[PDB]
Amino acid sequence: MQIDKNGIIKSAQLHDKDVGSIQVQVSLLTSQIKQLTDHLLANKKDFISKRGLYAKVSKRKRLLKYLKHNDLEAYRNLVKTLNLRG
Amino acid sequence: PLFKRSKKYCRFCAIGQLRIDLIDDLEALKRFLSPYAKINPRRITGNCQMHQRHVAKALKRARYLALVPFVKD
Amino acid sequence: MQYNIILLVDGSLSLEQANQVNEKQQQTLTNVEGLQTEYLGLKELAYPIKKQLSAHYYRWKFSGDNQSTKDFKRTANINKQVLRELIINLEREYGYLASINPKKQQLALQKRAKYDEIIARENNPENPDVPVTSGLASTQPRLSRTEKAQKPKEELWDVVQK
Amino acid sequence: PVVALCNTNTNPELVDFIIPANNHQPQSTCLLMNLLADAVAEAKAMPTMFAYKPDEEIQIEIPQKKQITSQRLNITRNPEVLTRE
Amino acid sequence: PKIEVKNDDLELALKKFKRVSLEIRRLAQRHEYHLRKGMRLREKRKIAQKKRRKFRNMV
Amino acid sequence: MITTTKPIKAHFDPVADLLTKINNARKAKLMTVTTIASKLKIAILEILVKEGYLANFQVLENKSKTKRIVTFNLKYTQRRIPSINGVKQISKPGLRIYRPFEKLPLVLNGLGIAIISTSDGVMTDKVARLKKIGGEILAYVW
RNA sequence: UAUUAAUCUAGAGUGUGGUAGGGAGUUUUGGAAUUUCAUGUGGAGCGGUGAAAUGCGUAGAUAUAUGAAGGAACACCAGUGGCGAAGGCGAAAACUUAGGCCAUUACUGACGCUUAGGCUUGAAAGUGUGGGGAGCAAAUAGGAUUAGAUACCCUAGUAGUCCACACCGUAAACGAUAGAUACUAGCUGUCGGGGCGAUCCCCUCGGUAGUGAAGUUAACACAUUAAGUAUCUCGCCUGG
Ligand SMILES: [Mg+2]
Ligand SMILES: [Mg+2]
Ligand SMILES: [Mg+2]
Ligand SMILES: [Mg+2]
Ligand SMILES: [Mg+2]
Ligand SMILES: [Mg+2]
Ligand SMILES: [Mg+2]
Ligand SMILES: [Mg+2]
Ligand SMILES: [Mg+2]
Ligand SMILES: [Zn+2]
């Protein structure tokens, strides 16, 4: 099973050519995590992937904190759709 | 002392092959191989590091497909 | 993806080993494109593996999903008529992006034919000479470099106060 | 005061009157050295040799012992300082 | 390592076999005692460095 | 219209950035240097050229009016020895130095200059004493 | 400076386009070499050492030829080398996967550095359970040497070295040099991306080395990959 970066960007874009915002970045990051949790659960001895997984987890948290500091309302819209809290 | 020419040239770079396949230049790789079914070093083979690694992987792959010998004896 | 198998079968007889290749083709390869095959045929073997030295050599240039490998690989060993099979996935070989790159091919072609004219050289060798053993410096620098030399992108700046 | 004929590889602080010139050519060297000698000779009141002179009298020859040039080579005579253990 | 004697002379044969055997000998002393990876890596780099420096002043 | 060739980047501290640039240029005998332009750096450099340690300082802007970089040169004498002797920064990030007017420092018994930006932009120590008003102390330059 | 209300891209990220890797895990495969066993030939030593002796051998050893089984590690390539944050990574393949370099008329618009506490990884030895065991070898036995030898030598030799799952979290874990940021001569190599178009070589952007001045050091020495000129943050030192 693999993902498609093109589809996630077209779905998560707020407006065209916005291929480098925070919403598109975090949506792509969450999708790779789902795939990466699967891979690590299967293997359980690959630690470089674990390091990458931890680093990626931390980046979303910092990114979500920033988007909370500025324009908190858009944070609510993105969080209810993506369902990342829990 | 001794004297000779520093001609030491990477063949594939001039011919720009850019790609090595074991069933496209098989007779070429046998030249790089020493008579003792042994991959010759830099001093003898003359290729650059990149093409030497490429020829080395190809030579070992041919030696797995059982196309070339592995040592005399 | 696009894979490349190099199959090995015993040296029994040509048509039946060709026939042997066809079952191995139609059974496995769950999802596949066109399977063009060539016939390197009964070439000598470097060692008596599987108590065999005369083998027919086949190469398959199919393309498909990653699932096309598992069933064929697990059935090859069981089949007593096949000595070896290698699915060399060319997307991981030492150099795959350059062969698809168009301008790279051109410059590669470019490089080979001139070096070859050098090889042809009116009464060239003067002795065995090896492929080269006789290569002069690239004369004066490749002037094309000096002319088509790329100027980087910096910036023009305008004075405001003094 | 010290004057010298620097050849691109000299520290300018040590010299006082630098005179950009060659130093490996047996022709450039001779021409410049006589010119300084010529100043001294004019000051001492004896006739000059090369300074304040026309074309016909300055021509000089190139000494014998490929071709007179000025390339610095012989780099193979500089290996790593003997080491290892 | 088969090399034919050619039956024309003998000396020439021992002149080449001496070379082949010395390179053969080299690996024979290498494979008698097991050394750790750090010590083993050190002797490889040392042999290469010895050969290198020699080739530097011989070229 | 002045052209360049290298990309211009700078360190974050604008007083010591200039100080590092000036000190390194002095030690390396360099003449032309470039850095990003800020109004604080422009103003402190303006009083610097008025107090006489550097010769010229020209700030330029992009064709889009989004970036500005100030490129200054030093005043070397004929024998090629500079006029600046030493620079040292006091109010580094983290520890900000605040001294009242009565405790305004005197640099090298008045030979050097102390740079103080009290309330009307940056201002030299001597004129600050004249106005009997003190404040932020950036760096010592002598 | 701090707070708030906003704008911009140069910091840092994202995408497209080039692109180099022994980066990692899982599953399969292969050849040399050793050991054991099977079958021949053969006929008195082999083995070991400073010299020997335990030891093996007419029950036919060593050797030679073929075959079978099994375990461990992957000559050459292999480097005045590559990758990873470190430990580390070198027979082959498949699947999954991490990061990085170069150019960006694209995008978000300070989203950045450090990090107490916390989490993850972390050589080898060691532990618990179950397999595996060819070779090697702590502990142990014997033969030597020795004034003595519980050691250096030799012959045997268990745990262990291997695999799966659980722990242990220490090393001269070293570049004896925390990370980030800005500036400061040069030369000689080598590697990667890019530009030209014979290689070779030239230029640009990076990685890895050598030499080398100002500068620094108590000296040795460092020296654009700093131990130089400076800033931020963390950890640590205060005689034996
Ligand atoms: Mg045998
Ligand atoms: Mg262990
Ligand atoms: Mg005892
Ligand atoms: Mg023993
Ligand atoms: Mg035990
Ligand atoms: Mg410790
Ligand atoms: Mg280490
Ligand atoms: Mg040094
Ligand atoms: Mg005490
Ligand atoms: Zn090459």
JSON list of C-alpha atoms in Angstrom, two decimals, chain C residues 58-134:
[
{"chain": "C", "resi": 58, "resn": "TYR", "atom": "CA", "xyz": [16.11, -16.59, -21.21]},
{"chain": "C", "resi": 59, "resn": "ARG", "atom": "CA", "xyz": [15.42, -12.95, -20.35]},
{"chain": "C", "resi": 60, "resn": "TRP", "atom": "CA", "xyz": [12.00, -11.47, -19.57]},
{"chain": "C", "resi": 61, "resn": "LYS", "atom": "CA", "xyz": [11.31, -7.74, -19.85]},
{"chain": "C", "resi": 62, "resn": "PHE", "atom": "CA", "xyz": [7.80, -7.55, -18.38]},
{"chain": "C", "resi": 63, "resn": "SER", "atom": "CA", "xyz": [6.47, -4.75, -16.20]},
{"chain": "C", "resi": 64, "resn": "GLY", "atom": "CA", "xyz": [3.87, -4.64, -13.46]},
{"chain": "C", "resi": 65, "resn": "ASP", "atom": "CA", "xyz": [3.09, -4.29, -9.78]},
{"chain": "C", "resi": 66, "resn": "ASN", "atom": "CA", "xyz": [5.36, -5.53, -6.98]},
{"chain": "C", "resi": 67, "resn": "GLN", "atom": "CA", "xyz": [3.15, -8.60, -6.49]},
{"chain": "C", "resi": 68, "resn": "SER", "atom": "CA", "xyz": [4.34, -10.17, -9.76]},
{"chain": "C", "resi": 69, "resn": "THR", "atom": "CA", "xyz": [7.47, -11.54, -8.05]},
{"chain": "C", "resi": 70, "resn": "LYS", "atom": "CA", "xyz": [6.34, -13.58, -5.06]},
{"chain": "C", "resi": 71, "resn": "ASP", "atom": "CA", "xyz": [4.53, -16.50, -6.71]},
{"chain": "C", "resi": 72, "resn": "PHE", "atom": "CA", "xyz": [7.10, -16.92, -9.49]},
{"chain": "C", "resi": 73, "resn": "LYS", "atom": "CA", "xyz": [10.00, -16.82, -7.02]},
{"chain": "C", "resi": 74, "resn": "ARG", "atom": "CA", "xyz": [8.45, -19.40, -4.67]},
{"chain": "C", "resi": 75, "resn": "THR", "atom": "CA", "xyz": [7.63, -21.72, -7.59]},
{"chain": "C", "resi": 76, "resn": "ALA", "atom": "CA", "xyz": [11.02, -21.50, -9.33]},
{"chain": "C", "resi": 77, "resn": "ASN", "atom": "CA", "xyz": [12.90, -23.50, -6.68]},
{"chain": "C", "resi": 78, "resn": "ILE", "atom": "CA", "xyz": [10.20, -26.19, -6.60]},
{"chain": "C", "resi": 79, "resn": "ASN", "atom": "CA", "xyz": [10.46, -26.60, -10.37]},
{"chain": "C", "resi": 80, "resn": "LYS", "atom": "CA", "xyz": [13.37, -29.01, -10.92]},
{"chain": "C", "resi": 81, "resn": "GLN", "atom": "CA", "xyz": [13.89, -27.71, -14.49]},
{"chain": "C", "resi": 82, "resn": "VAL", "atom": "CA", "xyz": [14.92, -24.15, -13.47]},
{"chain": "C", "resi": 83, "resn": "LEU", "atom": "CA", "xyz": [18.38, -23.46, -12.09]},
{"chain": "C", "resi": 84, "resn": "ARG", "atom": "CA", "xyz": [18.30, -19.72, -11.37]},
{"chain": "C", "resi": 85, "resn": "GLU", "atom": "CA", "xyz": [16.10, -16.68, -11.77]},
{"chain": "C", "resi": 86, "resn": "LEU", "atom": "CA", "xyz": [16.94, -13.05, -10.92]},
{"chain": "C", "resi": 87, "resn": "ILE", "atom": "CA", "xyz": [14.37, -10.22, -10.97]},
{"chain": "C", "resi": 88, "resn": "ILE", "atom": "CA", "xyz": [16.72, -7.25, -11.34]},
{"chain": "C", "resi": 89, "resn": "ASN", "atom": "CA", "xyz": [14.46, -4.27, -10.62]},
{"chain": "C", "resi": 90, "resn": "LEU", "atom": "CA", "xyz": [15.99, -1.54, -12.82]},
{"chain": "C", "resi": 91, "resn": "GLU", "atom": "CA", "xyz": [14.59, 1.28, -10.64]},
{"chain": "C", "resi": 92, "resn": "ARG", "atom": "CA", "xyz": [17.25, 0.43, -8.06]},
{"chain": "C", "resi": 93, "resn": "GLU", "atom": "CA", "xyz": [20.14, -0.42, -10.35]},
{"chain": "C", "resi": 94, "resn": "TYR", "atom": "CA", "xyz": [23.26, 1.74, -10.37]},
{"chain": "C", "resi": 95, "resn": "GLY", "atom": "CA", "xyz": [21.83, 4.29, -12.75]},
{"chain": "C", "resi": 96, "resn": "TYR", "atom": "CA", "xyz": [18.18, 4.44, -13.90]},
{"chain": "C", "resi": 97, "resn": "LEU", "atom": "CA", "xyz": [17.24, 8.17, -14.01]},
{"chain": "C", "resi": 98, "resn": "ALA", "atom": "CA", "xyz": [19.86, 9.05, -16.66]},
{"chain": "C", "resi": 99, "resn": "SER", "atom": "CA", "xyz": [18.55, 6.53, -19.21]},
{"chain": "C", "resi": 100, "resn": "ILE", "atom": "CA", "xyz": [15.12, 8.17, -19.10]},
{"chain": "C", "resi": 101, "resn": "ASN", "atom": "CA", "xyz": [16.59, 11.70, -19.14]},
{"chain": "C", "resi": 102, "resn": "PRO", "atom": "CA", "xyz": [16.48, 12.86, -22.78]},
{"chain": "C", "resi": 103, "resn": "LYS", "atom": "CA", "xyz": [19.23, 15.51, -22.86]},
{"chain": "C", "resi": 104, "resn": "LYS", "atom": "CA", "xyz": [21.60, 13.18, -20.99]},
{"chain": "C", "resi": 105, "resn": "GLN", "atom": "CA", "xyz": [21.20, 10.50, -23.67]},
{"chain": "C", "resi": 106, "resn": "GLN", "atom": "CA", "xyz": [22.02, 13.13, -26.31]},
{"chain": "C", "resi": 107, "resn": "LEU", "atom": "CA", "xyz": [25.24, 14.28, -24.66]},
{"chain": "C", "resi": 108, "resn": "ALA", "atom": "CA", "xyz": [26.14, 10.62, -24.08]},
{"chain": "C", "resi": 109, "resn": "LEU", "atom": "CA", "xyz": [25.61, 9.86, -27.78]},
{"chain": "C", "resi": 110, "resn": "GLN", "atom": "CA", "xyz": [27.55, 13.06, -28.42]},
{"chain": "C", "resi": 111, "resn": "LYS", "atom": "CA", "xyz": [30.52, 11.92, -26.34]},
{"chain": "C", "resi": 112, "resn": "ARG", "atom": "CA", "xyz": [30.71, 8.41, -27.82]},
{"chain": "C", "resi": 113, "resn": "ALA", "atom": "CA", "xyz": [30.72, 9.28, -31.55]},
{"chain": "C", "resi": 114, "resn": "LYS", "atom": "CA", "xyz": [33.53, 11.86, -31.32]},
{"chain": "C", "resi": 115, "resn": "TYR", "atom": "CA", "xyz": [35.69, 9.69, -29.14]},
{"chain": "C", "resi": 116, "resn": "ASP", "atom": "CA", "xyz": [34.98, 7.04, -31.80]},
{"chain": "C", "resi": 117, "resn": "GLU", "atom": "CA", "xyz": [36.07, 9.30, -34.66]},
{"chain": "C", "resi": 118, "resn": "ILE", "atom": "CA", "xyz": [39.30, 9.62, -32.67]},
{"chain": "C", "resi": 119, "resn": "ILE", "atom": "CA", "xyz": [39.28, 5.81, -32.63]},
{"chain": "C", "resi": 120, "resn": "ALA", "atom": "CA", "xyz": [38.75, 5.71, -36.39]},
{"chain": "C", "resi": 121, "resn": "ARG", "atom": "CA", "xyz": [41.57, 8.29, -36.97]},
{"chain": "C", "resi": 122, "resn": "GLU", "atom": "CA", "xyz": [43.22, 8.10, -40.43]},
{"chain": "C", "resi": 123, "resn": "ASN", "atom": "CA", "xyz": [45.80, 5.31, -39.90]},
{"chain": "C", "resi": 124, "resn": "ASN", "atom": "CA", "xyz": [45.11, 5.40, -36.12]},
{"chain": "C", "resi": 125, "resn": "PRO", "atom": "CA", "xyz": [46.82, 2.62, -34.14]},
{"chain": "C", "resi": 126, "resn": "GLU", "atom": "CA", "xyz": [50.43, 2.60, -35.46]},
{"chain": "C", "resi": 127, "resn": "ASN", "atom": "CA", "xyz": [50.60, -0.52, -33.18]},
{"chain": "C", "resi": 128, "resn": "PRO", "atom": "CA", "xyz": [47.97, -2.56, -31.19]},
{"chain": "C", "resi": 129, "resn": "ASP", "atom": "CA", "xyz": [47.53, 0.68, -29.23]},
{"chain": "C", "resi": 130, "resn": "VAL", "atom": "CA", "xyz": [44.62, -0.69, -27.12]},
{"chain": "C", "resi": 131, "resn": "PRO", "atom": "CA", "xyz": [41.28, 1.28, -27.33]},
{"chain": "C", "resi": 132, "resn": "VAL", "atom": "CA", "xyz": [43.34, 4.40, -26.57]},
{"chain": "C", "resi": 133, "resn": "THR", "atom": "CA", "xyz": [46.91, 4.22, -25.12]},
{"chain": "C", "resi": 134, "resn": "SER", "atom": "CA", "xyz": [47.10, 7.38, -27.34]}
]
